[PDB]
């Protein structure tokens, strides 16, 4: 067979141990999921320094704790805007997930609180910027470079899926690089606890699995499709399915006809054909062997999974930082004073925050 006796027993024991660690991790998650934390700091505790990113909900600012001197990223959400955009449940769900999970590649929520105008989520500052910026800056990652990042997403999705969470928002724009060159996942607004199927059309066109686009329901396998898209884009410099308009992107996806660059290794193409598999019955990560079909693929043969998890692998790229609070890896945004109203807005809707 493909493995001798020694190899097969080692791999089987390893996989059984993974299951045991995940069962314990799920118990810790569910304890915090059912009894979330709240109001663990206040706005006057921080100095606002610079906007790091901007979105529909509001702003993410670099701040510094006035007492501990530590730097943090503070996501600021305008309650009225969140209501107006009908994002109440997504916002509450993001915070509930962030305070309940624990994994080396998931951003750490340190504090959260709210006032009359806004909700605040204060996260560990990830100073290296988006993977997107670094990918477009150098064009494409070498296959070892892409594999290093891919392995972290594989472990992160294996963790999240064991908690019955579907991530659904994977793309280089949503992956931050930390000071050690490792990945941090920050955005969980689209994540959903799903033990069976779900139906919501959400996410980013290039990264949508066919069964998200089509009216049929879907499950966590859409994240393994999205992993295939990410690996492809990391190694090629562009995604497998693109067009001027999302509708034409969706047509390519549902065909799933993929062309690969001539510099892709045959190992990489085989893996991607099995991740970018339109047939649910055949997609890697969705078979009887689950994620081990991915972890045991020849493209990952040189991947030391424990070492990745333990963050003992030397990163292929370390962002430069000229001191604490360095924002040189982030774009610039229009500053604007945070205005707190004298009147409480949408208090009932955000009681659980």
């Amino acid at each position: 067979g493909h493995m001798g006796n020694a190899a097969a027993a080692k791999k089987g024991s390893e996989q059984e141990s993974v299951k045991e660690f995940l069962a314990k991790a799920k118990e810790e998650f569910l304890k915090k999921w059912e009894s979330p934390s709240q109001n663990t700091a206040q706005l006057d505790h921080f100095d606002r320094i610079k906007t790091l990113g901007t979105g529909s909900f509001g702003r993410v600012m670099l701040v510094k704790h006035k007492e501990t001197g530590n730097h943090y990223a503070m996501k600021i959400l305008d309650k009225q805007k969140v209501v107006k955009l009908k994002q109440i449940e997504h916002t509450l769900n993001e915070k509930r997930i962030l305070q309940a999970v624990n994994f080396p590649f998931l951003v750490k929520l340190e504090f959260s609180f709210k006032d009359n105008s806004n909700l605040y989520m204060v996260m560990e500052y990830v100073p290296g910027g988006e993977m997107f910026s670094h990918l477009r800056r150098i064009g494409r990652f070498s296959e070892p470079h892409a594999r290093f990042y891919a392995a972290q997403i594989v472990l992160t999705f294996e963790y999240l899926h064991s908690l019955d969470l579907i991530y659904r928002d994977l793309k280089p724009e949503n992956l931050l690089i930390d000071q050690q060159g490792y990945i941090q996942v920050t955005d969980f607004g689209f994540a959903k606890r799903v033990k069976g199927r779900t139906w919501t059309l959400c996410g980013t066109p290039e990264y949508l699995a066919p069964e998200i686009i089509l009216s049929k329901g879907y499950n966590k396998a859409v994240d393994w499709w999205a992993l295939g898209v990410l690996i492809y884009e990391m190694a090629a410099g562009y995604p497998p399915f693109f067009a001027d308009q999302p509708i034409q992107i969706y047509e390519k996806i549902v065909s799933g006809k993929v062309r690969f660059p001539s510099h892709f290794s045959s190992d990489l193409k085989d893996l991607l054909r099995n991740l970018l598999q339109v047939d649910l019955t055949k997609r890697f990560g969705n078979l009887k062997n689950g994620v081990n079909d991915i972890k045991n693929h020849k493209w990952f043969a040189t991947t030391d999974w424990i070492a990745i998890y333990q963050r003992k692998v030397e990163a292929p790229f370390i962002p430069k930082f000229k001191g604490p609070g360095d924002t040189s890896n982030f774009d610039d945004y229009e500053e604007e004073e945070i205005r707190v109203s004298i009147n409480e807005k949408c208090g009932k809707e955000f009681t659980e925050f």
């Binding site: 997107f132 477009r136 066109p205 290039e206 693109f242 001027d244």
Partner: peptide, 18 residues
Amino acid sequence: TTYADFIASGRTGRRNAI
């Protein structure tokens, strides 16, 4: 090239969720 077609798509910057 495929890459030239990617550039021509105009979807070379940051991509919004739907």
